[PDB]
Amino acid sequence: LPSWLRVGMNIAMLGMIHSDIRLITVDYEERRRFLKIKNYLSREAITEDHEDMEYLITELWSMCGEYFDEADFECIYSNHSSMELNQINGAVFRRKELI
């Protein structure tokens, strides 16, 4: 992951990480100038998750939009093992979980 994206996500995630977030990943498509953000939750998604992701993208683009023009997100209920989530590419946030 490019440093600008880890910086931007570090700041944007301030104040929106709650205990049911297992993993947040970002996929950066440089030629398309597009970002895909995935929020892996330990519960079904709620409307506040979508609001929080919209807030996050607004902040991230305001800081880092020289690098990307569009972004999409997904909120995913995952019951996969801690080992599996530990190995997904693009993690900018990963909760501590027992192996």
Binding site: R33, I57, T58, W61, S62, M63, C64, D69, E70
Partner: protein, 101 residues
């Protein structure tokens, strides 16, 4: 673009506000976000671009805040309109000034 500032969302970006989150981009202390928003609707402040998620970007023409990543002053704000109202996020000037061919 909505007509009412959502204070709870806007306050994340106002130092000393009850909702402020230290580290985020901040509006300057003398900046009234509702006055900026009223000036967008009155035509004082033009929408010059759109950012991700189709957010309008406005050039206010004078400093309105500073970017949390660069620390730099900016004249530009990203306009976020939701069901509970609007908030303005100071935009890194490079977001506007570094333009692809």
């Amino acid at each position: 673009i909505g007509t009412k500032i959502h204070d709870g969302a806007q306050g994340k970006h106002i130092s000393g506000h009850r909702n402020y989150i230290e580290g985020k981009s901040t509006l300057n202390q003398n900046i009234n976000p509702q006055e900026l928003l009223n000036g967008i609707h009155s035509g004082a402040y033009p929408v010059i671009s759109k950012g991700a998620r189709r957010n309008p970007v406005v050039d206010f023409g004078y400093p309105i805040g500073s970017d949390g990543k660069s620390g730099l002053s900016t004249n530009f704000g990203t306009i976020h309109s939701g069901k509970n109202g609007v908030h303005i996020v100071p935009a890194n000037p490079k977001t506007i000034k570094k333009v692809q061919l």
